[PDB]
Amino acid sequence: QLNHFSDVANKAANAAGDVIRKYFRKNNFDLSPVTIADQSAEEAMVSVILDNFPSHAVYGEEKGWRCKQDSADYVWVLDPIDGTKSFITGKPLFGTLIALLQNGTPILGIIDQPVLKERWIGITGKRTTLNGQEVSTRTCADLSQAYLYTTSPHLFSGDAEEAFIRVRDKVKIPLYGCDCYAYALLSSGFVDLVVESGLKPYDFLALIPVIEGSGGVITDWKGHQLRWEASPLSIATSFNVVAAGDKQIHQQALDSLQW
Amino acid sequence: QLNHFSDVANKAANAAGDVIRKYFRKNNFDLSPVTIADQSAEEAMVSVILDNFPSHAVYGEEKGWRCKQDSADYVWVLDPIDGTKSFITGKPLFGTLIALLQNGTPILGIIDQPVLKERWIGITGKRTTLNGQEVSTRTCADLSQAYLYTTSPHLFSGDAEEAFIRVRDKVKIPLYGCDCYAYALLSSGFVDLVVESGLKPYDFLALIPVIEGSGGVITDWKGHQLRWEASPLSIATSFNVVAAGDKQIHQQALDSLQW
Ligand SMILES: N[C@H](CO)Cc1c[nH]c[nH+]1
Ligand SMILES: N[C@H](CO)Cc1c[nH]c[nH+]1
Ligand SMILES: [Cl-]
Ligand SMILES: [Cl-]
Numbered sequence A, B: 001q002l003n004h005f006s007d008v009a010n011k012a013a014n015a016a017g018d019v020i021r022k023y024f025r026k027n028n029f030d031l032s033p034v035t036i037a038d039q040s041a042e043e044a045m046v047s048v049i050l051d052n053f054p055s056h057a058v059y060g061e062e063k064g065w066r067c068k069q070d071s072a073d074y075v076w077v078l079d080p081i082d083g084t085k086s087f088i089t090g091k092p093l094f095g096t097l098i099a100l101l102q103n104g105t106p107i108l109g110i111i112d113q114p115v116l117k118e119r120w121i122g123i124t125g126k127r128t129t130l131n132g133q134e135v136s137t138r139t140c141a142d143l144s145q146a147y148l149y150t151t152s153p154h155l156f157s158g159d160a161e162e163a164f165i166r167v168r169d170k171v172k173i174p175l176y177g178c179d180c181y182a183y184a185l186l187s188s189g190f191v192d193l194v195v196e197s198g199l200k201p202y203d204f205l206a207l208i209p210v211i212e213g214s215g216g217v218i219t220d221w222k223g224h225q226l227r228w229e230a231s232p233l234s235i236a237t238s239f240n241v242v243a244a245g246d247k248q249i250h251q252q253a254l255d256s257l258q259w
Helices: A002-023 A033-052 A084-088 A159-168 A181-187 A207-212 A247-257 B002-023 B033-052 B084-088 B159-168 B181-187 B207-212 B247-257
Strands: A057-060 A064-066 A074-082 A095-102 A105-113 A118-123 A147-150 A173-176 A193-199 A217-219 A239-244 B057-060 B064-066 B074-082 B095-102 B105-113 B118-123 B147-150 B173-176 B193-199 B217-219 B239-244
Touching (some): A002 A033, A002 A074, A002 A095, A002 A118, A033 A057, A084 B173, A095 A207, A105 A207, A118 A181, A118 A207, A159 A247, A173 B084, A181 A207, A193 A247, A207 A239, B002 B118, B105 B207, B118 B181, B118 B207, B159 B193, B159 B247, B181 B193, B207 B239, B217 B247, B239 B247
Parallel strands (some): A147 A193
Antiparallel strands (some): A074 A095, A095 A105, A105 A118, B095 B105, B193 B239, B217 B239
């Protein structure tokens, strides 16, 4: 069953990537391609998921929870295009995110960059892979040595901005720009810390098996389990995320955030 | 002669890309690959340039001006890896920059992304191309509608920070992260404005023919010609750059910068 879930997840990603490639870089003139692409890619992923698993649920931004039954043990939580600003501006560092949750816990995550043809797959029980090769996070001696990413300086509001700044000022260097891709880099051992505020569950659940299966750590800003039980009544509110390659760095970050 | 300059520039870029690909993503463990790569790639570019053009000069960050004669009409100004933070962190949006200057004016520029296999070529007299296909900037109705990039919020010091903020607050959205790649996106019509402070000449001269040959505008923050006459005594100081797809946007930006 678990290899069947992986095979179907890969089929979904293959379909989404062809759709997305059709619309990327079409907008260089003075519904938009990104909206069509998101919708069409989601439909292509859902269609193959539900053909293979009619008892499963799906969850996406626009349509919410959908299931032919009142309830489901298995829920696919999808974002065809995480990083729509990158997509719209022609930058190939957006990703397609696919998570499969069993009783609310992610058991499979994919980060797919269809232009670069890079696919990270996290599966509970397995080491994370990139294009079929195992990857690992790296150690990092101290927060002062850590390479930090976040999408944008402007995506922190209120007290979260002050907390971010506390961590930001302590790392080796803060870098910006690319949504889920930074977490993929962390999982491959090229980034030490990612700290973001205001992620919806379809933009973080796929990250969890990827990072954890690479040896990293990902929690909310209090260090609690990042969790969202997709259900008919779950609310897609936004969460604060901190991911690290090294658990000691993670703790240092938590101590600076003071959330 | 001009097609010979283009052929040799492409040979140089082909050599640099193979060198860089050898060292990219080797640093996922707990002289570095980026330093070796930069040095080796520069040497590979210089070696083919000077074999083809022994009367020419070359200019690079580490070695400065080099020429077998006291003077040269033609000077190649190179940066093997613009975006070393991206390179070090495994992000494939650094670029190799090659500029050829005749009497101090760029006549050829290349932006090469060797992982993505994307090459923008600007040649005076020709429309800019990406992988051999002509590209163009796009129009933009007003600064309020403009997509803006800059590498980092932290790369503005002093009065330049205040000037940046004046423009930043007026655009549709400010985005971050990727060095020369944003200028390539502008030249292809996917970005409207790029505003940066503190670029060395080896990181902007190649941009000029690329952007101008796409229909865009690139100047210093006073709207003056961005120029650096590479010579035995030229100082590689840093410059402020503003590039736009549309000349009306460019003017609006200048008016906000108030430099
Ligand atoms: N990838 C996320 C959704 O586009 C970016 C983000 C960061 N913080 C809040 N939102
Ligand atoms: N690509 C440039 C050199 O890495 C980035 C930069 C922006 N402003 C100052 N420096
Ligand atoms: Cl089923
Ligand atoms: Cl010669």
